Amino acid sequence: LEPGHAADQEQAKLIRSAIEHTTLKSVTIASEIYYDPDPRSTVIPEDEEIIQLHFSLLSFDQQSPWLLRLELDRAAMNDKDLTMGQVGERIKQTFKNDLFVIWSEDNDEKLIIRCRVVRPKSLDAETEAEEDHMLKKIENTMLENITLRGVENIERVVMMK
Amino acid sequence: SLMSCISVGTDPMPIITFLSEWGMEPLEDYVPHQSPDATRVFVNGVWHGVHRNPARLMETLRTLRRKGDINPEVSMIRDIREKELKIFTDAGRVYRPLFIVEDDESLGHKELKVRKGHIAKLMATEYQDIDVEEYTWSSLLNEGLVEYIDAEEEESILIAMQPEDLEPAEDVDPAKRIRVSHHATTFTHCEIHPSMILGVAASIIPFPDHNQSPRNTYQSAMGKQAMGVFLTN
Amino acid sequence: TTFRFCRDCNNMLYPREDKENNRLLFECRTCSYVEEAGSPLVYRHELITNIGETAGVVQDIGSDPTLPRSDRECPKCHSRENVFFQSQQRRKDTSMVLFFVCLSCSHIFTSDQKNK
Amino acid sequence: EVFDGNDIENNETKVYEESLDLDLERSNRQVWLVRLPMFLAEKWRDRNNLHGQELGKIRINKDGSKITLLLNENDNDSIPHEYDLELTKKVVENEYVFTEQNLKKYQ
Amino acid sequence: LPHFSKDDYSPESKGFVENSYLRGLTPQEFFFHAMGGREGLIDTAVKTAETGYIQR
Amino acid sequence: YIPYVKTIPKKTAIVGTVCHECQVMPSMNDPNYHKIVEQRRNIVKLNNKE
Amino acid sequence: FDMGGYFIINGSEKVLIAQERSAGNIVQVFKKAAPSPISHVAEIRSALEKGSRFISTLQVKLYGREGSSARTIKATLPYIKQDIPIVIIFRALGIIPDGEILEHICYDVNDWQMLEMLKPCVEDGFVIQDRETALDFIGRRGTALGIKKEKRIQYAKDILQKEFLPHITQLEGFESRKAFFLGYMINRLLLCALDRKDQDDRDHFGKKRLDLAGPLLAQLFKTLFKKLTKDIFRYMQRTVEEAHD
Amino acid sequence: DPNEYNEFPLRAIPKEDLENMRTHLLKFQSKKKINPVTDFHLPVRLHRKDTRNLQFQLTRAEIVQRQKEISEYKKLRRKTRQLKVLDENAKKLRFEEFYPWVMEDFDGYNTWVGSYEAGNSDSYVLLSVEDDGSFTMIPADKVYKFTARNKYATLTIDEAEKRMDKKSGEVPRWLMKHLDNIGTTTTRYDRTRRKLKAVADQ
Ligand SMILES: [Zn+2]
């Protein structure tokens, strides 16, 4: 560490978190593909409040009816100090503006991320068959090749005195 | 090892016929969805069918093997958790004998089937040669007091090291070794004697348990280079 | 996830969307048979899973002489005899929690005191 | 017994003097598929036997749930005279019995 | 070994030789100690060969 | 289509439909029982080979 | 005091040292290292102790790694030159319904995890939907080049009958047993892939066999007797052709 | 014992009618109840024929119509070789089962192909219930498992293998329905019914 903060442990943890490579796969439990008739109401009891909040306070007409849900582990996000805002922005910037994502706050009893692929103006009939397949493909890619923060080829870091 | 043996193999067709006649449903009409509790029966690595009461099937098979209807070299393993019943008859399997432990509710606790009367007859036959009815290791095997066990079958049995303290239900000399009882009441077999795990060369070392193992290996190697009397001719 | 098989040819059904009703159907890819969906869930990936923890439990588990016996109390019948074992998943990330099976009611409980 | 296939020439009329269509007339006949032990099958499947003699009788309880076979005294007191018929499948589907015979090749 | 119960993590089950050479080793301790000695012998041979090559 | 298929006609007839599947098992309470037990034990005890 | 157990050849006492080999007719599942397209492989060295003394190896490989979007199962059959999808093999064995194939593989109606991992196999084998097409698909892959267009189905059938899992049987009319055994192998492979069981230990003495003087001389005598019979037939042909006594 | 039970005579089958005839078992492999008396379109033929290309073979109704329209329109070796010993029973079984049983209805709605089962071919014994309360015993000969063929317009080997090549060219999800709309890749049943209806309409 820097000679002016070598003895500090909080800055040690900060730099360790800034260099350690962590992926969404390490902070998620499961991924689900759901069907929702419209991007305004939900069938899952839990996300009813999240959708209402985000939609109420602030396009959505052309969102696809297929939803991608990620269930994230608070015990996994507390081992390394992470907040939903950083990961949400990371996902939003991996694909700049070609899909809409909402994320629950840390205060929620359960941690969930909801994503929806946005279709273009043109309507494709052949892509409907592989729509769910495309969802699984993007799920695999966003699970594997996403660098939330850290340096490449860094498996794990351990602090020692 | 001293008491190790290698099976010579026998015909599996009689065992297949026996299993078929004792309720082994053919594999041609096995529907898993309507019977998610059947145990798969394997013979020499061939899935021949399924059975509904593996407990009774195994009990009958073990009784037959003990009394000598099936060749003792045949190995039988019941993987309860995996719901499998494997029977091996092919040659080349290494096995060794072990004592048989039964409930014997007369004393209220499990004990070896072999008794002091059996030992007396064995010793009488041993010393009469130097005329009571012959009583040999084959006699023990046919009376079901010992049983051949291979490595695969050893996976599904519990063996008591000695009958002196592990079999009885349950001051100490400071010089004696510290032995762990393991407090287990489900023993199915008992070692004849642990000293039989050693080989020919290693059975000459005196007190090998007080030596470092590399020294035992060195002695095993060297004892084959000691001068003696290889033959009398 | 509840995979569904076809009623006429026993083939595998696949999800489809009907825009006329904006609903979810399951249709067979070869015989043209359809059925309205019952739940909106069609895919699940379980990265951290607890399936297989108690795999291998049978009506005759207690007949195994290798399983260790315990004196723990079964909190549904008040019995003291039971056989316990560790998790059956071989992943090198699981805890050493013990699962106990009662020999009187065939009930399975756990020794966990953190989450239960 | 080789013969043409599609037979668009209508050769069956003279080659065969019998109908080639499956005879679906006795299909409405209850049939029991019974699996026998080896000892009983080795004497019930013999071709030098089965001259029409009485092999025994079947006894079924009036209320059902239990069916037994009572063989005659022709077994030579070497096998049991009483057996239980265990119904492995009370309701059986898609199982039929069909025969196979040759056809007349002339006219 | 086929002498303990499944899922046993005690020192005597996973190879802790409580006794000394003067007292003598119980059979299970003897087998585990033999396993360790065999590891040592194999390491000796392989390392001899590899070190010879490296020195050359 | 194909003009030739090379069929083999035969006289066949359906003469019954199976309704019950039965398994014959000797009665445990029969006086002649346990003779089959000895026979079945012999099935494995006897060795054909010389 | 002499115990025997040796042979005297040219006046020198010779003893046959027992040879240790891996037991056959047992399914063994192994994991492969990262630098490869196969993650798990279930192998069986099918062996028959009586009748031909030849060994045929059957392997079922799970292509793709844990980071792949589609992991399929492919089986290598003798004299095929390529790995055929398990679904196609099942259809060639006579089980066209995908429901029946999944019944043969997975024996639980709630093991949705294994069924999910099995989805890619049926997706890959979707095109083939009948026994004749599956049989010809397998047959054309064989390295015979004598079957033109109509013996392909029969060649594939004969291969699947006599060279596929020979330890079960080699006679016609036992496709159900072959299908069930293949499903068992795939089930074990899928369990290992789902990490519910560890890879089979290769050092387990229960999976090993010791060949004594008996089996060794048996196979040597088998080879020598085959050579002798070949020589007898050659002499018969020579006398019949060249008109000799 | 009391007469609460019911007993029926069991009689052997006369051997005078058991010669030159073999009784087999037919097992339809489907999840829906199948009855060839009511479900099938009579007449129904059960013969032995080659199963190769069992998608473009003339139906019985089509052959009858063809006959009607035809009537209207007309109105050295090596001299030394080694033969390998083969068991006569197996050779006979192969010869007899070379052409599997095929059961086809009149309209082609049902076309089943049978396969020989050797697991329990002979162990079974049949008990026919005579129309007098008595039972007659007949030995079993063989067991055949019948599977449906060409019920949902299966593709051909050429098309299937051409569709399997090339990672990037993945198989479309609803290709069967899309092609069925085109009209190609149909079944024998539909192909015969549409043509027969096109003739009947006139
Ligand atoms: Zn369908």
Ligand SMILES: [Zn+2]
């Ligand atoms: Zn309880």
